[PDB]
């Protein structure tokens, strides 16, 4: 049965609610982004209207084989009508195609559903500023003060400098980047751009990237592994064993690997500045763990919510345990007392 946190009250709308079969009373199913926990249940067998961004629609058609008749793409930053209700999709600063949805209810209530997001100050100067938002459905992935991380830009600058140095020292070194879903494409795109290369990958991953509306993409990526000095592999294969095996496959064209593992947070974010990062090394393979997040830090989340001043918050992440719900409720009350709403 569909949870209350996936229903928009006073409409027949749901958000990210595809794993429950037919939801009784639902006339329009929104999909915030193409991550499998959110699209779970969608397939060529789905026959109700799905509303989403253009990029998400491209993925639904080509990767999941959802029939075109049921895909309803909407543009961003544009007031649209769906089933007699005014809605706006906003960029979520998550993965490609990911949106937040603003619902303008017939009774006059305004609801923001963030989907998955990485809060940013630029959101305080969007259409959200034009009116009061009463209810917030919030991505609470990192809703605890220990979760700090660097900016995306600091992480990219580190990755670019690291790769340029290693390949200038050894022109026969290969760079490898791990991946398992869409998101975090700037890691590999920026390293390839500094090295004057295309990015090589599997046919399945190339197909995915060709759905993302990236300008000039044919100049940036290829399925010809041989021609390229930045390669993508599944995250699972970024270990000494998998990287040695891969080096064997390339026809001795490279004698060394430098690899990146973009992660979420792990325990050592608590001490180590990006400049201090050092890799794990075994012989001619070195691997760097880099904390590249597409979710809000605690401080980013707190800033956004204290700016928005919602009357009610409904979390969408870590809601399966009481302990987690209680802890989140405590932070929400702190933030409200501090900021005066
Ligand atoms: Ni996501």
């Amino acid at each position: 049965t569909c949870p209350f946190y996936k229903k928009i009250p006073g409409t027949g709308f749901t958000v990210d609610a595809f794993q429950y079969g037919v939801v009784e009373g639902c006339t329009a199913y929104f999909l915030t982004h193409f991550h499998s926990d959110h699209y779970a249940g969608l397939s060529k067998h789905f026959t109700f209207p799905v509303y989403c961004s253009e990029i998400t629609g491209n993925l639904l058609k080509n990767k999941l084989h959802v029939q075109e008749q049921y895909i309803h793409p909407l543009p961003l930053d544009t007031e649209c009508i769906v089933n007699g209700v005014k809605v706006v999709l906003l960029d979520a600063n998550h993965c490609p195609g990911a949106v937040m949805i603003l619902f303008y209810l017939p009774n006059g209530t305004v609801i923001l559903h963030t989907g998955d997001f990485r809060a940013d100050p630029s959101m305080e100067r969007s259409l959200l500023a034009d009116q009061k938002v009463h209810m917030l459905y919030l991505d609470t992935t990192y809703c605890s003060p220990e979760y700090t991380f660097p900016s995306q830009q600091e992480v990219i600058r580190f990755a670019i400098n690291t790769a340029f140095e290693a390949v200038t020292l050894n022109p026969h070194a290969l760079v490898v980047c791990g991946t398992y879903s869409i998101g975090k494409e700037k890691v590999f795109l920026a390293i390839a751009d500094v090295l004057g290369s295309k990015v090589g990958m599997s046919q399945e991953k190339y197909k995915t990237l060709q759905c993302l509306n990236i300008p000039e993409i044919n100049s940036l990526i290829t399925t010809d592994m041989c021609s390229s000095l930045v390669h993508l592999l599944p995250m699972m294969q970024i270990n000494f064993k998998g990287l040695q095996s891969h080096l064997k496959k390339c026809g001795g064209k490279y004698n060394q690997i430098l690899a990146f593992r973009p992660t979420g947070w792990t325990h050592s974010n608590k001490f180590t500045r990006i400049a201090d990062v050092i890799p794990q090394t075994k012989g001619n393979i070195s691997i760097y763990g880099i904390p590249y997040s597409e979710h809000s830090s605690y401080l980013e989340m707190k800033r956004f919510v204290q700016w928005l001043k919602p009357q009610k918050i409904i979390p969408t992440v870590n809601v399966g345990t009481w302990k987690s719900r209680s802890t989140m409720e405590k932070y929400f009350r702190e933030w409200k007392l501090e900021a005066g709403y």
Side-chain angles (χ1 to χ4, degrees), residues 8 134 137 143 203 229-230 253 260:
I8 303 301
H134 307 92
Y137 292 60
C143 188
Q203 279 179 269
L229 55 146
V230 180
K253 194 163 187 299
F260 291 96

Side-chain angles (χ1 to χ4, degrees), residues 94 114-119 138-150 152 180 184 262-267 269 290-303 305 315-318 324 327-328 331-332 335:
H94 186 52
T114 67
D116 284 346
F117 87 140
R118 179 161 187 181
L138 180 65
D139 169 16
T140 46
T141 302
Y142 296 125
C143 188
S144 194
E146 70 270 26
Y147 294 122
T148 61
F149 30 65
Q152 297 177 163
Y180 42 26
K184 311 190 189 184
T263 60
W265 175 101
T266 70
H267 188 55
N269 230 308
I290 54 175
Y292 189 95
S293 181
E294 297 182 336
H295 293 278
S296 307
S297 68
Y298 174 80
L299 286 168
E300 294 162 355
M301 185 188 302
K302 181 183 173 283
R303 175 179 172 128
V305 172
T316 68
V317 184
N318 307 318
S324 288
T327 303
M328 288 188 293
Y331 288 113
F332 302 153
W335 298 352

Side-chain angles (χ1 to χ4, degrees), residues 31-34 52-63 71 73-76 89 91 95-99 182 185 208-215:
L31 179 61
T32 61
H33 68 291
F34 195 76
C52 60
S53 65
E54 194 185 315
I55 292 165
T56 296
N58 295 345
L59 295 158
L60 289 183
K61 179 181 172 201
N62 293 289
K63 298 295 291 191
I71 309 172
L74 304 177
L76 302 189
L89 298 193
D91 204 303
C95 69
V99 298
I182 67 172
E185 293 76 12
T208 303
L209 298 189
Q210 287 286 169
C211 289
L212 307 184
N213 291 348
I214 297 170

Side-chain angles (χ1 to χ4, degrees), residues 143-171:
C143 188
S144 194
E146 70 270 26
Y147 294 122
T148 61
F149 30 65
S151 75
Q152 297 177 163
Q153 189 276 338
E154 290 177 74
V155 176
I156 295 299
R157 172 90 278 161
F158 174 84
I160 291 171
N161 296 351
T162 298
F164 183 79
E165 177 163 313
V167 184
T168 309
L169 294 174
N170 179 193

Side-chain angles (χ1 to χ4, degrees), residues 193-203 205-213:
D193 173 76
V194 78
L195 297 179
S197 187
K198 299 204 189 201
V199 185
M201 64 200 66
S202 77
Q203 279 179 269
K205 186 76 199 187
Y206 184 91
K207 182 178 177 185
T208 303
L209 298 189
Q210 287 286 169
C211 289
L212 307 184
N213 291 348

